[PDB]
Amino acid sequence: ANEVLLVVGGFGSQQSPIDVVEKYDPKTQEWSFLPSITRKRRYVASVSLHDRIYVIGGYDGRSRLSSVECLDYTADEDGVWYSVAPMNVRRGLAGATTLGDMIYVSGGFDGSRRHTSMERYDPNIDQWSMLGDMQTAREGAGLVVASGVIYCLGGYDGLNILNSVEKYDPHTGHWTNVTPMATKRSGAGVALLNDHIYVVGGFDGTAHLSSVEAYNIRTDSWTTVTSMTTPRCYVGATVLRGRLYAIAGYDGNSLLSSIECYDPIIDSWEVVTSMGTQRCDAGVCVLRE
């Protein structure tokens, strides 16, 4: 039942992509380092599946990455990351999620173009498969699964910040539009809590945002939520033990080491901890121990 939070790579305060992987245990309220990833990767995504941490694409300062590597979370202090099949496309600032026993990765930038494509990883065969294309090409969008359906929210198409939301049903293989967010956001963090997809922070073209919105998947409608303690752009989001966590990010002035948590019943955000690193555009995921 204990869930831990993993924060992988991103952009660090020394103005460089980083390879640092930190783990936060809510039980001890301590951070620990895991073995570092093999390459420095900013604009990176991460997911967990079958107690394996996956680090997906990104940018190493020179190349956008199709590379993917994996860490078995049951390993001891002495390692070791291992590569698995690369994606079909190079993707910086892609959205990544899991549904069933498979990884879904959409959008991103390859250094030339933003992607409408989504692709899927099957661990049993170590293969990535191209799936259907979104209507709008996007980088900086989140991917989230809510009751067997994937939602891709907001982002940036190379000129415009987007408030558009698309959903993908594995049963149909099609993307269709749903009701958009109030505010256009790129680099917002996204997670599901109760029956609602929460979208936290990001950048609206003008300002770095502390604003939060929640989408009722049952009623196709958006509502404003209590704002974060601070603006956070290129911020991670996930849920540990029934609470929404926002991880690190850029506040418009500095990179952040803090993590803050939201509880809908008391309707409050508070900073609960700080990592040893300040970062943005880190990948984030949760493992159950």
From Swiss-Prot:
Ubiquitously expressed. Highly expressed in testis and at lower levels in the submandibular salivary gland. Transmembrane segments: none annotated. The keyword Transport applies. Keywords: Cytoplasmic vesicle, ER-Golgi transport, Kelch repeat, Repeat, Transport, Ubl conjugation, Ubl conjugation pathway, Wnt signaling pathway. Its main location: cytoplasm. The BTB domain is required for interaction with CUL3. This is Kelch-like protein 12. It comes from Homo sapiens. The gene is KLHL12. The chain holds residues 279 to 567 of 568 of the full protein.
